[PDB]
């Protein structure tokens, strides 16, 4: 009834996610192979430690390409979103080109030629690192397959990692309810109330669609600096899709 | 203020539209000034907007029909008299090779080269309607027998020959050059992460405008 590329891409990504989840479950069953698999099942295959190591190496080598694909795409889109937020913070809300304007509501309200030309110019400027004062032209709603692939790979990573596993008082550290997963918390003594926990100063910000950032301050990441070039000790700042594939 | 820079004033000192269009209507962009009382017809031109109404509440009329400039009948016009052209060009040379004024943009955020290119494009569009002085009661009417201005092309040619001006044009929006009318100019009051994200990029909107007006709008000349 539709015959759309995006539907096929999303469905294939869903299938890939199912297969990767099954692979992760099977490899997580390796440590307890004898107790869980060998004894209960009448017909099981003997497993050795070197066989398991070779299996892990094989799985990582097979999963490397899709991992690079998702990392490139996700770093690109994250850089675009972070730049949009920074420009919104540094921009004039009255201008029609501001991110936080009614004209960008995407539901209340150019030509197709204009849209494609905007997309092409955005691609070129982003590639040459020249996207200043112009909002990046992207459609995150068309990245469903990337979402599925990223979810599957993060599931695999998380499952197998969990398989692997007066000053500074526990009272003075932020709890799960306010801390951000993967970001260091603002130092409780350097920053004032109006910028550390904006909800206490303004308790009316609590809305059903309310970001955690504006309710409990803007977190920061410990990246870029402290040397190293591992590709994940450096924060995603480049906005194209090639340089985050080169990285 | 940037709009008072001598180079900008020199380049924006063109004569009035009425000086060559006479009293007959013509197709040109129309500016209205609230301070001088120029609304609901009785409208001025671009040169009058840049010179006569510098600092007034002068804007552009979007729904602009054919009209002439009548700045003379409502306010004192400084654009009806044209100075010595040779002295103008000589002063342009001396200011280009004596001070680095060409690097600074104006109040609208446009470098001198972009302003000159836009002026040349608009002049090429408009001056084609100039009817020559064909041979075939109002004593206070300003003199209307002078040629349309032809300084913008010479200024553009001479500024493009200057290396510093061209470098400032092409590297506009980079780390060093930053226009006041840009969101990335003042970012020193933001969080370090937002500062990094904004500082990574460089500006190319002004350069794109310059190239587009030079290639697709300045169709008259290839020089
Ligand atoms: Zn005039
Ligand atoms: Zn005025
Ligand atoms: Zn005037």
Describe the protein.
The structure is cut from a larger assembly and holds two copies of chain A. Chain A is an all-alpha fold. The longest helix of chain A is centred in the N-terminal third of the chain and has 41 residues, at 49-89. The first copy, chain A, is globular and about 70 Å long. Chain A has helices at residues 5-28, 33-38, 49-89, 112-127, 144-164, 193-196, 198-201, 212-216, 243-246. The two termini of chain A are 41 Å apart. The A-B interface holds A 79, 82-83, 85-87, 89-92, 121, 125, 128-134, 218, 220-221, 224, 235, 237-239 and B 173, 182-184, 186-187, 190-194, 196-198, 200-205, 208. One zinc ion binds next to loops of chain B.
| Percent helix range of chain A | 40-55%
Bound ligands, each once: zinc ion
Structural class of chain A: mainly alpha
What is the radius of gyration of chain A? Answer: 23 Å
Number of strands of chain A: 0
Written as H for each helix and E for each strand, in order along the chain, the element string of chain A is HHHHHHHHH
Shape label of chain A: globular
Strand content of chain A: under 5%
Counting copies of identical and different chains, the oligomeric state is part of a larger assembly
Largest sheet of chain A: none
Discrete helix count of chain A:
9
Summarize the largest interface: chains and residue counts.
Answer: A-B, 27 and 21 residues
Distance, first to last CA of chain A: 41 Å
PDB class: ligase
Keywords: hect, Dimer, ligase
Entry title: Structure of the human UBR5 HECT-type E3 ubiquitin ligase in a dimeric form
Chains A, B: E3 ubiquitin-protein ligase UBR5
């Amino acid at each position: 009834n539709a015959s759309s590329y995006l539907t096929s891409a999303s469905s294939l990504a869903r299938a890939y996610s199912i297969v990767i989840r099954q692979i992760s479950d099977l490899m997580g069953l390796i440590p307890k192979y004898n107790h869980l698999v060998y004894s209960q099942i009448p017909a099981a295959v003997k497993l050795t430690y070197q066989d398991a190591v070779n299996l892990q190496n094989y799985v990582e080598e097979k999963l490397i390409p899709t991992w690079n694909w998702m990392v490139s795409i996700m770093d690109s889109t994250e850089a675009q979103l972070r730049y949009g937020s920074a420009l919104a913070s540094a921009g004039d809300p009255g201008h029609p080109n501001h991110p936080l304007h009614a004209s960008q509501n995407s539901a209340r309200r150019m030509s197709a030629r204009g849209d494609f030309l905007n997309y092409a110019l955005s691609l070129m400027r982003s590639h040459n690192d020249e996207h200043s004062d112009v909002l990046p032209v992207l459609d995150v709603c068309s990245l469903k397959h990337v979402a599925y692939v990223f979810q599957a790979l993060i599931y695999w990573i998380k499952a197998m990692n969990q398989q692997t596993t007066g000053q500074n008082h526990p009272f003075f550290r932020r709890s799960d309810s306010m801390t951000f997963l993967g970001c260091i918390p603002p130092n409780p003594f350097e920053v004032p109330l109006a910028e550390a926990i904006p909800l206490a100063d303004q308790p009316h910000l609590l809305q059903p669609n309310a970001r955690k950032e504006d309710l409990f301050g803007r977190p920061s990441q410990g990246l870029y600096s402290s040397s190293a070039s591992s590709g994940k000790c450096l924060m995603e700042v480049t906005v194209d899709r090639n340089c985050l594939e080169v990285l | 203020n940037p709009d008072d820079s001598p180079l900008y004033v020199l380049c924006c000192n063109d004569t009035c539209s009425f000086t060559w269009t006479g009293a007959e209507h013509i197709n040109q962009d129309i500016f209205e000034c609230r301070t001088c009382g120029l609304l609901e017809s009785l409208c001025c031109c671009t040169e009058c907007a840049r010179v006569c109404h510098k600092g007034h509440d002068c804007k552009l009329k979007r729904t602009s029909p054919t009209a002439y400039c009548d700045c003379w009948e409502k306010c004192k016009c400084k654009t009806l008299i044209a100075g010595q052209k040779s002295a103008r060009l000589d002063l342009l040379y001396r200011l280009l090779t004596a001070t680095n004024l060409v690097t600074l943009p104006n109040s609208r955020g446009e470098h001198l080269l972009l302003f000159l290119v836009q002026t040349v494009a608009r002049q090429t569009v408009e001056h084609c309607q100039y009817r020559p002085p064909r041979i075939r009661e109002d004593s206070d009417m300003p003199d209307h027998d002078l040629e349309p201005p032809r300084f913008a092309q010479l200024a553009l040619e001479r500024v493009l020959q200057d290396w510093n001006a061209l470098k400032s044009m092409i590297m506009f929006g980079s780390q060093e050059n930053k226009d006041p009318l840009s969101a990335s100019s003042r970012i020193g009051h933001l969080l370090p992460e937002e500062q990094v994200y904004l500082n990574q990029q460089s500006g190319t909107i002004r350069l794109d405008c310059f190239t587009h007006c030079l290639i697709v709008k300045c169709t008259a000349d290839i020089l």
